[PDB]
Amino acid sequence: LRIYAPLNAVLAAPGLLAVAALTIPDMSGRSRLALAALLAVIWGAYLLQLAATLLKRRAGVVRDRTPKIAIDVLAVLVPLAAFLLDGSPDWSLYCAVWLLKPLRDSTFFPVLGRVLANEARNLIGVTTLFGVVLFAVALAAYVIERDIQPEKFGSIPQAMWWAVVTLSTTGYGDTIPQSFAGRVLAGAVMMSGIGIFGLWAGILATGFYQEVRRGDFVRNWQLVAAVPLFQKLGPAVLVEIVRALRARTVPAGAVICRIGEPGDRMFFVVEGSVSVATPNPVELGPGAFFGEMALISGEPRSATVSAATTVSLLSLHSADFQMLCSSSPEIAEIFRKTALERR
Amino acid sequence: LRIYAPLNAVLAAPGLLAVAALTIPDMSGRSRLALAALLAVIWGAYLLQLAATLLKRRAGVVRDRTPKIAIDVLAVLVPLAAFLLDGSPDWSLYCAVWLLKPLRDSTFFPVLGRVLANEARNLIGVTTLFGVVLFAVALAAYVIERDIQPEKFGSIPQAMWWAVVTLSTTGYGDTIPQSFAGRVLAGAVMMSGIGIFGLWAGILATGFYQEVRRGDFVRNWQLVAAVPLFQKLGPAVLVEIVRALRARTVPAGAVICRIGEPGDRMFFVVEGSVSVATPNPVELGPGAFFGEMALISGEPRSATVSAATTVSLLSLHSADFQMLCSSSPEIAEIFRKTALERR
Amino acid sequence: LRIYAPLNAVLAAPGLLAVAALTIPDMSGRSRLALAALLAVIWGAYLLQLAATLLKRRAGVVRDRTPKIAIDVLAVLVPLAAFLLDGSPDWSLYCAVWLLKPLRDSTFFPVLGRVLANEARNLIGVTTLFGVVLFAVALAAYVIERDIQPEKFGSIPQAMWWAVVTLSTTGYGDTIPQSFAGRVLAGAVMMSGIGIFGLWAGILATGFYQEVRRGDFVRNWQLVAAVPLFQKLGPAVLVEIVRALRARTVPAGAVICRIGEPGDRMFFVVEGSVSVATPNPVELGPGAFFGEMALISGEPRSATVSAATTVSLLSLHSADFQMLCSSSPEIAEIFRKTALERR
Amino acid sequence: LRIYAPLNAVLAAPGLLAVAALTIPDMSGRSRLALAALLAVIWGAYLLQLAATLLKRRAGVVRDRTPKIAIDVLAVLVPLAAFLLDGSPDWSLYCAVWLLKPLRDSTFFPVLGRVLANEARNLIGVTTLFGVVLFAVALAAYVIERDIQPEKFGSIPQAMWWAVVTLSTTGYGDTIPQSFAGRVLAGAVMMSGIGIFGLWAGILATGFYQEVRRGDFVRNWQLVAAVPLFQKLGPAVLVEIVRALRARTVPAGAVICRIGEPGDRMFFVVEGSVSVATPNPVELGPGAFFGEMALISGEPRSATVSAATTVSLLSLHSADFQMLCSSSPEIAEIFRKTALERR
Ligand SMILES: [K+]
Ligand SMILES: [K+]
């Protein structure tokens, strides 16, 4: 269900992308002039934004900042500095700083610092074991091919390189054991590979799970707060739901729900309003749920539900939905009649 | 066990596969004439089916449709259009549309939109981070080999390409740092690799997990309606069972359970009938469980239980089976006497 | 710890491995005569074993069999047949059958069948999605390089091959887009790669998790069944322990616990006996636990605990151990005083 | 946050790394003289420490050792032996032993032995299955290319090598099916690959998870013990917290909490002291928590909290924090007043 609410999503990211677009030599006149010019203007928009932030201390209702400001500070100062110090050639390198911006929207890095942090004593141990494993292999591979390939196994670092290629799963094809036994040794190498392949894996596995778990405070602590519905529940029931709860702003003109289109979930409205294409034009206010008969029934969208405007929405899975109907019979009853209003 | 169980599974899939067989130049023979003709006939079968769906509004007693119809509409209209608009040599491209059909029987894509959707703000950030990482690497690799390989590192996009090959774990072997330091840098590239290799991973891991979760809850609900047995239980106990419950439809002639053959689980019958090769011919009706003494005992299939006909079966794990025997001692008692009937 | 513990593990496996050692042409004298001869003798030993099983209805202590016998039947008949039917030089191919044997001691394949089976309706869909994804890529890649490489992209299957190389993470290096855009297209391909990389993964993730889950049936009877200790507990407490419980059979002469050697767990004895190197020689009978002061204290092995003989041991985690001590104060008291006996 | 926190971490690791730096041929005098000499001195420092451990029976107040000592013994004796036995040019190989040390601070290897150990019966079966799969492929690949590439597929081991390259996801590029059908067979090979790719995976997945689970006794059993806070809770609540609890030792001069800097957690002090940059200079004693208003509020670090000295800190997640405040309202109340002192 994507039309325009991620309106903000729709227009800032591109500035970050254009950095790559410019990056090319042996380039013609028609595209280079426009693109190079655009970054200076984007830069200026951000520069204007900075004056507001450094200078201004009001955001609306609630907000907090510090290292985050530092990130923004670095982002604007660097491209500027490139412009100033460098009256010369490549300084577009300095522009790259844009990519710093997207990290702000995620639940990852300052937290990653925290999580990477609490297990630095062990995770580091795994990688060190890794450097070590690379070392023993270099010794093994080198002895078999030193005389035959002074050219390729001439040295430990040459052997070390092959370990690098072989260890990860890349295998370039330029260097290989010409002799029969070396191939046999690689057989052992293949076995150490299972473990190795797994290491690449340990790092992201903990990080993604962590990062997702973290969004629970932003997305699933604050978000839970607007829906008054969430309050009947205490700490144990809420966390399972918290892992489950999902966000997304739908806007002006978006077809939230297509009429006729399957709805295997229901939507809750936090902010903004939505419109229902039905018998009695229903505009939905905060504390509203729609497509609920979708679940009672197990069928579609009741109406074309189109976001009246920019609206933040929460959706509920069938497993979770039974919990809400059971927790509050009154709520099951309301979903059905409101659904009657919705359908 | 498989014989003619998903009778339906056995037949439709082949039409989807034939698209690949046809797709060959420098072709001759008996093979090309038959195959090209078959797609038009398959198209016609589906075309006939479409008239039925567009025209017909009765399905028995269990269905709902909309975007799904749209998929079917696209599927038939496209190969049709190629036939009409194109009197031209290549229109078999348009036929490919068949592969759209398999998505229909999965728990994934409409659902995928919901998963990918609720975490689009975090998930895309990781990939954007990926473009970023790729960029810095292009810079580092390019500086090392620009003079040496105007031919290979002639430009950022050339460097960028190497980052693509190297980042994933593919490594073609046509480009590499000739110089020693470059090889050393690749050592750093290798450590960034763990993170990288992991990204490829974050995407399917979440999708498969959800996809299975989506199908399972519905399957459990269906089993509960179908198996009266499921009703004693409330929302908390059923979900664990729901992840566990599993289904297929055995048919005519399938030997559901080989006699003598180990049975480490038992089967429940939702629809259809089954036949038991035992002292008293036993045909099993709905609400029937068999091979239960298999579990009480911990041994095989009681009988050659062959599907009397097309039958939908559910199987229960030993861990789960204890829960059913303990929840209802009456049920445990029944499993043993019926088992006496079954064995 | 290992000495001759799985006395059985030590000897049968080698016969399975020897199949590979023989497999070499341009072979000479001393190795070939012995190795070829050995398989016939191993075959004969198995043939004798078969006569016993086909003709024998007695057991060491409780068993069940049917499809398993069929596996054994196929295993001996094939190398036999090769011997008889083939006076021909290559029939060692038929010998390979040995590898069928190891599947017998695992918790996987009959189970894999049932599990793969209950989700063939969806796992197959993912792979099908894979064949189709492969198809769109072949079309895309072919278009860019048809004129340039009639030799490499001369045909869809030629393009299809590259999709195979690229899709998995192998990348041979013999084929690549010569032109700039193809490399750009490969950029999209790289992104579709993450999804693909994940598919390879979806299959094992379900199988390994489950295969381990399955051994619970063997494990519960094995540790829970012979340790009277396990009976205080009911179905909910046991399963968590069940995932946790672990086993091996130590033998004659094995030093179960090195004396002075850290013991981060304790061992339970199901079958066989063990000896303790301490003030009072202690031989441990069934229903015995040792190295428990290792946990109360959090320090090593009390004594060199050496398996008096072939013994089946279960070990308990510190997390689990607290549950045992808390569930039964009397048990906590016994562990310390017995420990006094052990230390 | 990191400054001189693990003071110890900062110094020992480098000695381990230096082994790689020295290991280079075609080297020059300026770098080589210093580096070669450093290992002898590092060796001597370790030699000194060993005499202390060998001849000493005290330290701090709570330790145990045996196999661990054996590791240390092997570590010093080896480089010594190389020095003594070998007046010879290459003995730096013997020095490598340093890397043995890192395993000491991890929760993995003795324990890995423990887990690998209770699952030798099942992991081994999969790996052997792997050799088996490799065998069938060597047979199939060899038949297609024996005449064409006596040079590449001349033998099963030559075919076997390709199986190694192909099986893992490396693909060098030197040996490929020239013929069309092999390319088709490779299509089957690609499918068996998913299964293959997964094997590499089963090994690290269980190992990392268990390894992390293991630090629960060191880090989350005895270590938690210093927070009196942990006592109210019983065995079930603690384990969830135990997986969650995390540690580092900040030192002299580290700014624990940047002031202004987001604090999305709070820190507990086990050992050492910390200083708070606020209205009342606050030095924090053991049993202290800071940045708690960070959670009540959901905003940063109250103060620049800088480690007064070497301090061991525990940090608490928001999900966990709610449990703490709810378990003891008295504690919630204390967090806010202390927070008043901290802020
Ligand atoms: K590769
Ligand atoms: K390659």
Residue owning tokens 């990191």: D2
User: How far is C157 from D234, CA to CA, in rounded Å?
Assistant: 64
Q: Does D25 reach chain B within 8 Å, measured CB to CB?
A: no
Radius of gyration of chain C (CA): 28
Beta carbons of B190 and A167 less than 8 angstroms apart:
yes
Among candidates C193, C198, C216 on the partner chain, residue whose Cβ is nearest the Cβ of B319: C216
- Proportion of chain C in helix, strand, coil states, percent, rounded to 5: 65, 10, 25
Beta carbons of D290 and D279 less than 8 angstroms apart:
no
Is B298 within 8 Å of C173 when comparing Cβ atoms?
A: no
User: How far is B42 from B148, CA to CA, in rounded Å?
Assistant: 58
Closest chain B residue by Cα to residue D171? B170
Smallest Cα–Cα separation from B121: which of A246, A125, A180?
Answer: A246
Q: D150: Cβ–Cβ under 8 A, 6 or more apart, which residues?
A: none
Is C262 within 8 Å of D64 when comparing Cβ atoms?
A: yes
Q: Does A218 reach chain B within 8 Å, measured CB to CB?
A: no
Distances (CA, A) of A225 to A124, A238, A250, D52, D158: 39, 11, 19, 60, 65
Distances (CA, A) of A116 to A204, A211, B25, C120: 11, 11, 54, 39
Q: Give CA angle at C140 (C137, C144), nearest 5°.
A: 135
User: How far is A223 from A248, CA to CA, in rounded Å?
Assistant: 11
Question: What distance, in Å, lies between the first and last C-alpha atoms of chain C?
Answer: 19
Smallest Cα–Cα separation from B260: which of B237, B236, B280, B277?
Answer: B277
Q: Shortest Cα distance from C171 to chain A (angstroms)?
A: 7
Q: Give CA angle at B120 (B119, B124), nearest 5°.
A: 120
Is B169 within 8 Å of D169 when comparing Cβ atoms?
A: yes
User: How far is D50 from D71, CA to CA, in rounded Å?
Assistant: 11
- Phi then psi for residue C31, to 5 deg, are -75, -45
Q: D4: Cβ–Cβ under 8 A, 6 or more apart, which residues?
A: D10, D251, D252, D253, D254
User: How far is C88 from C81, CA to CA, in rounded Å?
Assistant: 12
DSSP state of A222: I
Smallest Cα–Cα separation from D44: which of D11, D69, D7, D15?
Answer: D15
Report strand pairing: C288-290 vs B311-316: unpaired
Contacts of D16 in chain A (CB under 8 A): 128
User: How far is D181 from D72, CA to CA, in rounded Å?
Assistant: 57
Three-state secondary structure call for residue A307? strand
Q: B44: Cβ–Cβ under 8 A, 6 or more apart, which residues?
A: none
Contacts of D172 in chain A (CB under 8 A): 171-173, 176
Is D172 within 8 Å of B173 when comparing Cβ atoms?
A: yes
Technique of determination: electron diffraction
Question: What distance, in Å, lies between the first and last C-alpha atoms of chain D?
Answer: 19
Q: Report every protein residue that has its C-beta within 5 angstroms of ion ligand 2.
A: A 171, 173; B 171, 173; C 173; D 171, 173
Chain B 260-289, CB below 8 Å of chain A: which residues? Answer: none
DSSP state of B320: H
Domains observed in chain A: 7-105 (1.20.120.540), 118-211 (1.10.287.70), 228-342 (2.60.120.10)
Looking at the DSSP bridge assignments, the partners of residue B289 are B268
**A170 CA to middle of ligand 1, Å?**
3
User: How far is D108 from D211, CA to CA, in rounded Å?
Assistant: 5
Q: Is C271 annotated as a binding residue?
A: no
- Phi then psi for residue B26, to 5 deg, are 60, 30
Smallest Cα–Cα separation from A194: which of D50, D281, D167?
Answer: D167
Contacts of D117 in chain C (CB under 8 A): 1-2, 246, 248
Q: Does B187 reach chain D within 8 Å, measured CB to CB?
A: no
Residue A280 neighbours by CB distance under 10 Å: 8
Contacts of B172 in chain A (CB under 8 A): 172-173
Beta carbons of C340 and C293 less than 8 angstroms apart:
yes
DSSP state of D105: G
**B26 CA to middle of ligand 2, Å?**
29
Smallest Cα–Cα separation from C79: which of C28, C19, C23, C9?
Answer: C19
Q: Shortest Cα distance from B327 to chain A (angstroms)?
A: 22
Closest chain C residue by Cα to residue D153? C25
Task: Give me the long-range contacts of D275-280 (CB less than 8 A, separation at least 24).
Answer: D275/D305, D275/D306, D275/D307, D275/D308, D276/D302, D276/D303, D276/D304, D276/D305, D276/D341, D276/D342, D277/D303, D277/D304, D277/D305, D277/D306, D278/D302, D278/D303, D278/D341, D278/D342, D278/D343, D280/D341
Residues D180/D184/D185/D186 CA torsion (nearest 10 deg): 100
Strand order from edge to edge, sheet including D246-250: D246-250, D311-316, D266-271, D288-290
**A286 CA to middle of ligand 2, Å?**
57
Residue A213 has which token pair? 């778990």
Distances (CA, A) of C85 to C61, C81, C82, C91: 39, 6, 5, 9
Q: Is B154 annotated as a binding residue?
A: no
**B121 CA to middle of ligand 2, Å?**
35
- Shortest-distance ligand to the CA of residue B193: 1
Residue B258 has which token pair? 């080989």
Q: Does D173 reach chain C within 8 Å, measured CB to CB?
A: yes
Q: Does C10 reach chain B within 8 Å, measured CB to CB?
A: no
User: How far is A300 from A314, CA to CA, in rounded Å?
Assistant: 17
Half-sphere exposure of D221 (CA within 13 A, CB side): 17
Contacts of A173 in chain C (CB under 8 A): 172-173
Q: How far is CA C131 from the centre of its chain?
A: 30
Beta carbons of D163 and D171 less than 8 angstroms apart:
no
Is C172 within 8 Å of A173 when comparing Cβ atoms?
A: yes
Does the CA dihedral A304-A310-A316-A321 come out positive or negative?
negative
